[PDB]
Amino acid sequence: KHKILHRLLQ
Amino acid sequence: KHKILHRLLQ
Amino acid sequence: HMLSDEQMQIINSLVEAHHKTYDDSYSDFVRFRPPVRRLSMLPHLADLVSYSIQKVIGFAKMIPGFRDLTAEDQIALLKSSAIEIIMLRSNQSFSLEDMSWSCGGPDFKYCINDVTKAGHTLELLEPLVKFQVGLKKLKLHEEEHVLLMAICLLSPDRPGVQDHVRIEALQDRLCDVLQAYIRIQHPGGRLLYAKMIQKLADLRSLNEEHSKQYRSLSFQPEHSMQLTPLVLEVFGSEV
Amino acid sequence: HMLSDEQMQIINSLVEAHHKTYDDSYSDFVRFRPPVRRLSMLPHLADLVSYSIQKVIGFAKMIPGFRDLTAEDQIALLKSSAIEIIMLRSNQSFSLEDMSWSCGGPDFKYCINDVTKAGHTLELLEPLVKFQVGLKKLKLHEEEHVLLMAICLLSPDRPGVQDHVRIEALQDRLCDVLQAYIRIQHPGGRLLYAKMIQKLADLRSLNEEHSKQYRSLSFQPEHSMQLTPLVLEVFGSEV
Ligand SMILES: CCC(CC)(c1ccc(OCC(=O)NO)c(C)c1)c1ccc(OC[C@@H](O)C(C)(C)C)c(C)c1
Ligand SMILES: CCC(CC)(c1ccc(OCC(=O)NO)c(C)c1)c1ccc(OC[C@@H](O)C(C)(C)C)c(C)c1
Secondary structure (H helix, E strand, O other): OOHHHHHHOO | OOHHHHHHOO | OOOOHHHHHHHHHHHHHHHHOOOOOOOOHHHOOOOOOOOOOHHHHHHHHHHHHHHHHHHHOOOOOHHHOOHHHHHHHHHHHHHHHHHHHHHHHEEOOOOEEEOOOOOOEEOHHHHHOOOOOHHHHHHHHHHHHHHHHOOOOHHHHHHHHHHHHOOOOOOOOOOHHHHHHHHHHHHHHHHHHHHHHOOOOOOHHHHHHHHHHHHHHHHHHHHHHHHHHHOOHHHHOOOOHHHHHHHOOOO | OOOOHHHHHHHHHHHHHHHHOOOOOOOOHHHOOOOOOOOOOHHHHHHHHHHHHHHHHHHHOOOOOHHHOOHHHHHHHHHHHHHHHHHHHHHHHEEOOOOEEEOOOOOOEEOHHHHHOOOOOHHHHHHHHHHHHHHHHOOOOHHHHHHHHHHHHOOOOOOOOOOHHHHHHHHHHHHHHHHHHHHHHOOOOOOHHHHHHHHHHHHHHHHHHHHHHHHHHHOOHHHHOOOOHHHHHHHOOOO
16 A cells, blocks of 8 residues: 555655 | 464464 | 352463463563653554553463454454453553552653553543543452453454354353352452443443544554554454 | 766755765664564664665655656655665664674664574675675765665666656766766776676665565564564565
């Protein structure tokens, strides 16, 4: 899903 | 999935 | 009247399982990400809670009849009751003098304000502290405390439970034991049982409120990323 | 010959982004689960690595052109290069006297044996230390070190990369900058560039070996449960 990476990439 | 719980429940 | 063997063996099994899964020295707390007084206490409390879940699982596997249920039922009972069992075992370190949980050092002395820094509101913490105090006052014997936890974890009325009949029977037997013990070994415990069963009702409301607040937290990746894989699994809804 | 503006601005941007995402005091290490010398160093190193990923992401978002790519491409580049960038930034704390990484205190001084207690074999650690030493010897300027990291993270030849053309152009421009800088500002750096590009090749092999060993670890729940949600996401294969 990559929800954390998305959030961190702003 | 619960793979951790399964493992811990032996 | 007096207690029977396969009834006293149950009590010895539970008491021993609790001792085997509850560290009185709290020497594992130094291994958690250190406490820090947005949501500064989340890393520490997440590790505390993850570690407690592991203990609850160890305890559950030693409850007579639990290990024979289906993995699906064991998981359904654990996921829906884990927070209630954690709240019950935490009472052992609760102190009525400072309304806080003291686990060894001053670093590991949790105030209602600390939990606030882990993402929770007084909407939960207020009833929680009230619950802790009420329970602390019942001055339960180790035998009743452990029986209360096993009775809570073996509740057939939890979402996801399939073999509701076998679980109802396991919990009924645990209830007799608790009733017989209070009546025979607890001088002045005439009204105790009902007050204990009342505490299970209180836990349902705390569980419900904790789940809402946790859901809110788990939906924000900057916070969920601070949780552990076990906490995410047990409190998650991906059943 | 000399460097141009939009070429020197690139170098100033990268150097500043590195400073903004690399704590020389290592004061955040005390917040990680403490190191412990089955796989006793996994909790600490997992937190170290999770924290580094966050830094790499902060660095990436400041690489000119990176923030304009698609989220999918940004993620594809981050997931496939994260470990290589971590290995490059860790060289800053590598010491040729003790062949170890020293990050402030003696508690945060990592030996090749410590990584072993995090689930890795000499099959990886041997080439890794060899890489660290070789790179340490190139005595790169901060400008070349940071350029090497940006060039590595902007490699179009990574699985999952879609807009391979735009990424090829971003990395080509970063390469010119590095080549011009070594030629103009690095006395004795005649053979440097080729040796640096060689280091990117070495990283590919380390990345490959690290991925195998990590896959093995992630397949055992008693170990994967010690990882963080960010580490599981970035090193996971659920793209
Ligand atoms: C600090 C108080 C408490 C109380 C039940 C706790 C939990 C386990 C404990 O250890 C007892 C034991 O035997 N362990 O093995 C002790 C002494 C206290 C708690 C902790 C975190 C909380 O909020 C936490 C969760 O909402 C997250 C972090 C999001 C999952 C909430 C609402 C309450
Ligand atoms: C201890 C050495 C190292 C070397 C690249 C490291 C990583 C980040 C660091 O910090 C530098 C920095 O700037 N951070 O922001 C520093 C100084 C060292 C490492 C650590 C864990 C490892 O194994 C770990 C992984 O395999 C797991 C735990 C499974 C994900 C491996 C194979 C290597």
